[PDB]
């Protein structure tokens, strides 16, 4: 029914620790696999940490908060999600100071919040800048996601696809350098071909099918008209349908239906465009006038899709077709191609101009390959987005967590009070990241982790991480595990904030 007292905070630990203990071995390139039993007897062997916790039914409420926060992390960054839950579970894994020591939660919460500002300032000291003009340096960065995949052969092509696409969407004049993949970077798939044939289309491609055989197949200078309203007989303010039981009245309603549709379509063809793009649907009587003009009929195009077309060919959005002016034209468009590609109808408005957006064309032999190439380029574009926002890299392979753990230990000597004990626990909680990398490789954990702490004490903390494949110690200047700083900052801010949120709840009450 409900829980109260120390059992809530002690229960929230076991709930968050149990969820974390599953994916502990899912981190790293050597990460172990898992087995899920379907209710019908099926088996899913996927090692992806996002798919595992998605199919697991969790009873405890705090266990749901661990999953919902990880799902939000996937939207912003498609990497490092597993590291968030491991750190969020390890920081809460030490219950000694929580209960046995009889310390008040706010005393411990103040320790994490002070340790959070120190973990952020340490990463900026050990970071390194990046030259975004050279595409060779961006190649080894993206290869982190490309490795152990089937696109490794086309990896050289996969880099140019994600790099040039994000650079177009990035608008640096505003000062915030905002990049939106879910709109301007929108991707569609093309059946047929091979992986090499995949290129980056400059423009906005529409998947609308060809309804009638009369359309413009190829145009040197396309003309595009953008208007929101649908082409139909004008109705009343309500949705009430028109019911006519008399034949004489049918001729009165049909004449009004043919007159208004022909009137709006007459003002559209006055400019003589090559296509008509409407936001809503298009009736059958309206398509009869569109096929007579020998122009392409396009409908069901959202607002964001229309905003990109207006900046591409120079179009203009008008509320009603009767108000269309000469300002709406498609002048400047490269070509218009309705030609069938891969047994599917495509539309190319592509041009020589950069309307803060583009379209990615995915070629492939089968739909199984298309699904593999798609998801592999998605996170690769997010890697390009995270680097262009903060062009700074931090050493990976566990070198970043150990470099911060050494700074927290040295600073705790000057801290005087009861908060020094939980403040040092954060330094030992960051060692779980290099620990799982060694355990998955098979090498001894205690022997290597002890010698690793001696390297950051003497040598520079920017190097000497942990090799995941081999298992020994290697510098990060000689290896490509360098990771973007924007990912590590979001990881530590989320791991600490989630651990604080669960400690603040001392009672679970059921009611509405």
């Amino acid at each position: 029914k409900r829980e109260s007292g120390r059992k809530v905070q002690s229960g929230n630990i076991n709930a968050a620790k149990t969820i974390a203990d599953i994916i502990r071995t899912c981190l790293g390139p050597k990460s172990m696999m898992k087995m899920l039993l379907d209710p019908m007897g099926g088996i899913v062997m996927t090692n992806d940490g996002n798919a595992i916790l998605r199919e697991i039914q969790v009873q405890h409420p705090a266990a749901k908060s661990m999953i919902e926060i990880s799902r939000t992390q996937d939207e912003e960054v498609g990497d490092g999600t597993t590291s968030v839950i491991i750190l969020a579970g390890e920081m809460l894994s030490v219950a000694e100071h929580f209960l046995e020591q009889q310390m008040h939660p706010t005393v411990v919460i103040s320790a994490y919040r002070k340790a959070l500002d120190d973990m952020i300032s340490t990463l900026k000291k050990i970071s390194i800048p990046v030259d975004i003009s050279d595409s060779d340096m961006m190649l080894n960065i993206i290869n982190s996601s490309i490795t152990t995949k089937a696109i490794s052969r086309w990896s050289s092509l996969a880099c140019n696809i994600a790099l040039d696409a994000v650079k177009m969407v990035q608008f640096e004049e505003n000062g915030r350098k905002e990049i939106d993949i879910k709109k301007y970077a929108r991707v569609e798939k093309i059946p047929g071909g091979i992986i090499e044939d995949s290129c980056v289309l400059r423009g906005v491609m529409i998947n609308k099918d060809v309804t009638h055989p009369r359309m413009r197949r190829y145009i040197k200078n396309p003309r595009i008209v953008l208007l929101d309203s649908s082409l139909e007989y004008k109705k009343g303010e309500s949705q009430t349908d028109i019911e006519i039981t008399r034949e004489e009245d049918f001729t009165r309603i049909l004449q009004m239906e043919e007159e208004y549709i022909q009137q709006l379509c007459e003002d559209i063809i006055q400019l003589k465009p090559d296509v008509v793009i409407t936001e809503k649907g298009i009736s059958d009587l309206a398509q009869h006038y569109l096929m007579r003009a020998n122009i392409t009929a396009i409908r069901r195009v959202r607002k964001t899709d229309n905003n990109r077309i207006a900046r591409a060919c120079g179009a203009r959005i008008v509320s009603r077709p009767e108000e269309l002016r000469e300002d709406d034209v498609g002048t400047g468009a490269g070509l218009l191609e309705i030609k069938k590609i891969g047994d599917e109808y495509f539309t190319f408005i592509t041009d020589c101009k950069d309307p803060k957006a583009c379209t990615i064309l995915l070629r492939g032999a089968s739909k199984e390959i298309l699904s593999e190439v798609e998801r592999n380029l998605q996170d690769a574009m997010q890697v390009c987005r995270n680097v262009l926002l903060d062009p700074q890299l931090v050493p990976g392979g566990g070198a970043s967590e150990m470099a911060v753990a050494h700074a927290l230990t040295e600073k705790s000597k000057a801290m005087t009070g009861v908060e020094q004990w939980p403040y040092r626990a954060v330094a030992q909680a960051l060692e779980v990241i290099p620990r799982t990398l060694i355990q998955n490789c098979g090498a001894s954990t205690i022997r290597l982790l002890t010698s690793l702490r001696a390297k950051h004490t003497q040598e520079n903390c920017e190097t000497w991480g942990v090799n995941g494949e081999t298992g020994t110690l290697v510098d990060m200047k000689e290896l490509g595990i360098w990771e973007p700083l924007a990912v590590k900052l979001q990881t530590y801010k989320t791991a600490v904030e989630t651990a604080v949120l669960l400690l603040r709840i001392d009672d679970i009450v059921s009611g509405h």
Partner: protein
């Protein structure tokens, strides 16, 4: 049914597998032993209610009394108990140290075994850190005794040993015990606890107690002889009563007149028995049991002093001093087995007469501390503080070095060892840091027993030691969590008391970790 019990091949003796951590459970029996005597450590230590094997009600905070009355049947826990018996050798203090500290080493060794660190490397960590603590301890010596045989100096250093046993009374016990100790000190190297004894007498309170020279017996002189200088002392355990004969010795009485005739012959026979004592030149007689009424008059006729000792330990007390031995026969004329004493007299101290054996011709190291109290269980606890008080001075006959108490040296020695393990590479740095944290348990025991938070005390002791201020221990108060200087207060411990206590407690914890299994046997 298979599978059955695991790792049991011998005599059904319960064995613990790797998942049950047989080593961990041997520590669990050692931790429960420490939890019993932990609350009794310090001047605020709680009193324990002990039921004697005779079904007597005892209330005492003494650690040695608890371990003797509580039977410990666990083999590994006996190793810590046997370390406490060796703790009473060479020094008379530090009993609670071994129980609390050795239990802290095994408790902290649990976290090292859960990490997967081998038990063999944990042993090497304590042994290296043990030798490091022995080097730093001489540098922590604050002051030293001047050995001037001054009562004010001896009574000042004893107040620390009197506390944690009898509290609030340490002012009187420090002056009385000192007066008996200063007298022996002119004798070099022969000072020992056997010279100073304890004689308890029912009285008003502790403030009525005094100190007397020589051997003092609580039983007053039964005879009318005030003082006698006779050296010969006849001690016999056979009480004065109707004499029996080792041979047949049959007695047939029929009429009433034969009752009086054989009674007069017995009185005439007891006359020659007392006369034979005076014929051997013995004016002192000792009776273990009941003294007859008729024989009491023959002692005053020949002026032979009568002594009655009911306790057996008081009889063996004289056997090892004057040399007089008890015989099973009733007053046989044996002059060879008697004793020798310079002077014997009766004295009255505290409205009670006591028999005093004092040597006028020979100086002697013998003294006595007479105690007064309204409860026998109360005087027994005071006697426990006297033995621990005198044994502290027996160590001062050796090299004189003093260290502050109240957890002052425990934090400073833990701070120095922690810095050593930090700069020492390798895997042994784990056990060294845990060995330093075992020193933190002693101040925690003083804080918990005083009703003060432990984390607040440990935090303040680091700040004062980090700034360079030494000799700072824990202030004992209920409402005052803060700390004060130990040197100004006068609380000081013994160097050899801490030296031997750390070495014995270390070997006690290491020996337990070496034994991973307990197996029965039979001859």
């Amino acid at each position: 049914k298979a599978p059955g019990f695991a790792q049991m091949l011998k005599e059904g003796a319960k064995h613990f597998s790797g998942l049950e951590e047989a080593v961990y459970r041997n520590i669990q029996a050692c931790k429960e032993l420490a939890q019993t005597t932990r609350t009794a450590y310090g001047p605020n230590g709680m009193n324990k209610m002990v039921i004697n094997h005779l079904e007597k009600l005892f209330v005492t905070n003494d650690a040695a009394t608890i371990l003797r009355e509580l039977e410990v049947q666990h083999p590994a826990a006996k190793m810590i108990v046997m370390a406490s018996h060796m703790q009473e050798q060479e020094v008379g203090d530090g009993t609670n140290f071994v129980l609390v500290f050795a239990g802290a080493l095994l408790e902290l060794a649990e976290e090292l075994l859960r990490i997967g660190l081998s038990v063999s490397e944990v042993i090497e960590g304590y042994e290296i850190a043990c030798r490091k603590a022995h080097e730093i301890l001489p540098n922590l010596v604050c002051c030293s005794a001047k050995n001037l045989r001054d009562i004010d100096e001896v009574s000042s250093l004893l107040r620390t040993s009197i506390m944690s046993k009898q509290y609030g009374n340490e002012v009187f016990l420090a002056k009385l015990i000192a007066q008996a100790c200063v007298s022996i000190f002119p004798d070099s190297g022969h000072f020992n606890v056997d010279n100073i004894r304890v004689c308890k007498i029912l009285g008003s309170g502790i403030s009525s107690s005094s100190v007397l020279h020589g051997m003092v017996f609580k039983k007053e002189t039964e005879g009318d002889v005030t003082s006698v200088k006779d050296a010969k002392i006849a001690v016999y355990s056979c009480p004065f009563d109707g004499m029996i004969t080792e041979t047949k010795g049959t007695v047939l009485i029929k009429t009433a007149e034969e009752l009086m005739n054989f009674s007069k012959g017995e009185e005439n026979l007891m006359d020659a028995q007392v006369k034979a004592i005076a014929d051997t030149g013995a004016n002192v007689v000792v009776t273990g049991g009941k003294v007859a009424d008729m024989a009491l008059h023959y002692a005053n006729k020949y002026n032979i002093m009568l002594v009655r000792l009911n306790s057996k330990w008081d009889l063996r007390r004289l056997c090892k001093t004057v040399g007089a031995t008890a015989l099973p026969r009733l007053t046989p004329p044996v002059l060879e087995e008697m004793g020798h004493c310079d002077s014997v007299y009766l004295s009255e101290v505290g409205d009670t007469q006591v028999v005093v054996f004092k040597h006028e011709k020979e100086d002697g190291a013998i003294s006595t501390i007479v105690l007064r109290g309204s409860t026998d269980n109360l005087m027994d606890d005071i006697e426990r503080a006297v033995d621990d008080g005198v044994n502290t001075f027996k160590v001062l006959t050796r090299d004189k070095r003093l260290v502050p108490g109240g957890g002052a040296t425990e934090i400073e020695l833990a701070k120095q060892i922690t810095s050593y393990g930090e700069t020492c590479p390798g895997l042994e740095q784990y056990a060294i840091k845990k060995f330093a944290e075992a020193f933190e348990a002693i101040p925690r025991a003083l804080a918990e027993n005083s009703g003060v938070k432990a984390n607040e005390v440990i935090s303040k002791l680091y700040a004062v030691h980090q700034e360079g201020n030494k000799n700072v221990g824990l202030d004992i108060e209920a409402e005052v969590p803060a700390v004060k200087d130990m040197l100004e207060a006068g609380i000081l411990d013994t160097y050899l008391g801490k030296y031997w206590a750390i070495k014995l407690a270390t070997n006690a914890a290491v020996t337990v970790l070496r034994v991973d299994q307990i197996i029965m046997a039979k001859p």
